[PDB]
Ligand SMILES: O=c1cc(-c2ccccc2)oc2cc(O)c(O)c(O)c12
């Protein structure tokens with residue numbers, strides 16, 4: 252019983268966090284095998300934040316301009332290369348603590364854990380969601396760039412996020428591990444703003460199922476709804492439109508609780524209309540949307556508190 | 558910028574979790590030096606659960622009844638022992654990944670990270686606070702017993718909790734690592750109910766400072782309050798009494814933000830007897846009380862381990 256915003260155990264990522272310095276700029280790097288990945292704006296100086304030509308900045312660098320530090324050991328760079336907005340430093344030494352891993356790109360609504368790091372050393376870990384506007388609501392101070400987001404499935408670390416910048420509204424944008432940004436963002440200090448954010452509908456429904464699994468159903472009602480009539484209502488509360496694919500993904504959870512997806516959609520419609528009237532759901536007075544259907548099945552029991 | 562429920566990195570504890578099997582029952586153990594710590598109720602059977610005699614139950618078993626598994630390697634038990642409600646299994650191997658550590662007993666209102674485990678394998682990590690009624694609101698299924706809660710200070714893990722049981726309302730009860738129970742519960746299948754809980758006042762104010770530090774200031778006001786006057790208000794809403802020492806502990810947060818403590822107390826007062834008036838604070842519709850003052854200073858200055 253209980254339900255928590257639960258990150259993955261971060262030990263396998265802790266062993267890969269290094270420190271990258273170029274001139275007077277220091278950030279975090281990801282050491283896997285004999286390569287260190289870090290954001291390419293590590294090569295920018297104070298007069299390079301607005302309109303940097305990274306190709307022109309990189310060609311002015313030798314291998315010995317990049318100081319890489321793994322704890323106390325100094326890894327010697329023997330090669331460097333740029334791929335989109337991530338820099339790849341070939342080092343002397345394969346990281347002995349390298350886990351099994353893969354680089355993946357995720358879609359909005361999907362979740363991942365963040366190991367917030369500073370100077371190559373970890374500060375904390377927490378759960379995150381790629382918002383529909385391709386930002387994340389993380390906890391990032393200056394120097395955290397290079398901190399990675401990840402999921403762990405059967406001792407394989409699927410790396411999905413690398414932090415690059417802080418937006419003027421306080422949310423955060425970054426790339427996948429091949430250097431391609433999430434959203435229309437770029438590694439320039441010029442004025443950027445994210446699109447209008449939106450609530451992750453399929454996640455709210457999965458969360459409602461998790462509340463039923465844990466033994467609460469005061470919010471259900473006797474109604475059902477059509478998918479289109481639900482989407483017409485939900486979008487007036489700034490919810491993402493719910494697709495048939497999402498409906499199919501809530502299949503397992505609909506089968507565990509015996510509540511049909513469009514029946515849970517009907518309950519959500521009433522919750523948006525009424526609020527909670529001084530009640531809570533899984534210890535929250537808002538509608539949580541940063542648990543995916545796979546997250547809920549992972550953390551929740553296989554038997555409902557019926 | 559941004560503020561999140563941030564757990565400690567779990568890698569140091571990850572290398573200490575093993576599987577403990579006694580006959581039918583399988584739970585988790587903590588492998589440190591050459592000892593394995595785990596709840597003593599791993600010794601009970603379905604029959605014993607109602608009025609067990611742990612001393613007699615334990616006398617009747619030897620070292621080979623205890624199956625300890627560290628991943629793929631099996632650790633031999635060379636001795637078994639009981640210290641309060643935890644079982645100590647002496648093993649043939651000192652854990653090589655044993656970190657610098659100590660056993661610490663915490664206070665209600667204090668926070669820690671929980672490494673939820675199943676069959677000796679870590680599955681997740683999250684922040685807890687110990688409730689003033691000595692329960693914690695964790696996320697545990699069956700098989701999670703033996704999972705530990707910990708804090709970190711510059712390379713030193715401080716173990717403060719071991720999970721033992723779920724109470725009927727779904728909250729959880731456990732012990733420190735010396736086997737002493739937090740709160741008035743026993744490792745017996747019987748009728749046990751958590752006391753009436755209350756809200757950790759000093760933690761709510763620390764979280765309001767965190768909201769100010771993050772440039773979210775709409776709840777402040779121009780009033781004052783004495784300590785007493787605020788305490789008379791807080792007790793109606795079932796808030797823990799805020800002592801002088803709590804006001805002292807909020808000093809550094811007061812200094813950084815420019816908001817005097819009792820001015821923030823005045824701001825919490827109006828927030829209680831009137832509500833949020835539709836707005837939120839740090840993306841939350843509730844007044845969060847699971848951040849200590851130290852948590853707020855650690856997250857907003859980025860202390861590392
Ligand atoms: O938002 C950031 C933007 C840039 C940046 C640097 C050069 C050119 C363009 C953008 O560098 C950063 C470095 C950090 O360590 C950090 O925490 C950050 O949030 C940023």
Ligand SMILES: O=c1cc(-c2ccccc2)oc2cc(O)c(O)c(O)c12
Nearest residue numbers: 598606698699700701702722723746
């Ligand atoms: O609540 C629990 C109670 C008991 C227990 C122990 C001895 C006598 C009677 C009951 O064992 C457990 C074992 C677990 O693995 C677990 O997750 C649990 O929640 C419990």
